[PDB]
Amino acid sequence: PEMMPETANIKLGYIPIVEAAPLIIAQEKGFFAKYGMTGVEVSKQANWASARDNVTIGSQGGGIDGGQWQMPMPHLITEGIITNGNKVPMYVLAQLITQGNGIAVAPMHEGKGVNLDITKAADYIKGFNKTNGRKFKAAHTFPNVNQDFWIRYWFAAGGVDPDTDIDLLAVPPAETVQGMRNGTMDAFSTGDPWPYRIVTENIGYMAGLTAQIWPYHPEEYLAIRADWVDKNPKATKALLKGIMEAQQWIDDPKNRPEVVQIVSGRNYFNVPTTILESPFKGQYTMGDGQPAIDDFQKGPLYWKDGIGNVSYPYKSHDLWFLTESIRWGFHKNAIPDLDTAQKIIDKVNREDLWREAATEAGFTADIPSSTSRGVETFFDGITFDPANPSAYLQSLAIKKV
Ligand SMILES: [Ca+2]
Description:
Blueprint: E1 9-14, H1 21-28, H2 31-34, E2 39-44, H3 48-57, E3 66-69, H4 73-78, E4 90-95, E5 101-105, H5 122-126, H6 128-132, E6 137-140, H7 146-157, E7 167-170, H8 173-182, E8 187-191, H9 194-200, E9 205-209, H10 210-213, E10 221-225, H11 226-231, H12 233-250, H13 256-264, H14 274-277, E11 283-284, E12 293-294, H15 315-327, H16 338-348, H17 351-361, E13 376-377, E14 383-384, H18 389-395
Parallel strand pairs: 1-2, 1-3, 6-7, 6-8
Antiparallel strand pairs: 3-10, 4-10, 5-8, 5-9, 11-12, 13-14
Calcium ion binds next to helix 7.
PDB class: transport protein
Keywords: alpha-beta protein, periplasmic solute-binding protein, ABC transporter, bicarbonate, transport protein
Assembly: monomeric
């Protein structure tokens, strides 16, 4: 009864991308059941807006109790910032993965220098309307979160202001890719399994992977409503242990063929396994005359990366997401300063539960010693010191503060 979950049921949402792997694998390989969570429903969300709506509603209303999220969605939902004032407190419990994301660009931009560092192509992009009849058009999957941040960082590092120099919009992924085929979309912030299809089907090329923009960067996370977690503490830790074991399992190369087979199944991603076999080996055809990537360390990682533990949710990473939100002037009234950002993080990030769950499960040797992963370094040399986010913001060339 000590480890017995208060309830064996929970509804967790996911989006059909590699970031969802730990949830799918924990369920399909019996890791959730091992700890008593035999009633986990891994529910596919139609899109990010729908996932947001479903967690706001909650399972009792026909929605979800938590799930996979781009950052800082849990924080924004907790503060009612993206729910029209409906504050639904949530807890960030674990990071699901790092990498497995990238930026794609249309073929018409090849030989223009639109690669990892777009500095030399800045003027080309900025004057696209006069030369090509329209503003450079790029898209993400939901505003103010991960993909938006990745493409914005990429543009801004090369001298392109994502708010004034281009048309950065939120567009469905299928509509976005179709746009690239039609010659109306110039680039988009995506992730696996999308890159493979884009390059193999000559829809475009890969300007760069997020693994190149910020090696081992924080990515998507598991977050559950605070009311559910507060009511079911034992069940919450059981879920964490199941996820941790699944992450460890996924990172063993020997299990990746099965991982790919399972997630690509009809009842999940529903896509040909061939489009994910390469990424899970760290293999990517970049195109545009650039060398292909062949490095396991540059593909998706779920348990351990080159810096620290992937799963442990470092508060310094929540801090970067809120600091970058401030950089772009997002939620000007709700998050007006870094102090407010830290207060939100202390209410949302529950790294303490991750530590507790890891300890009980026997993973003490993998627990990071600090809540900070230290100074972070981006591909353009900019560094983020969690101890001084103000200095990070001031070191950036393009920003709204
Ligand atoms: Ca992502």
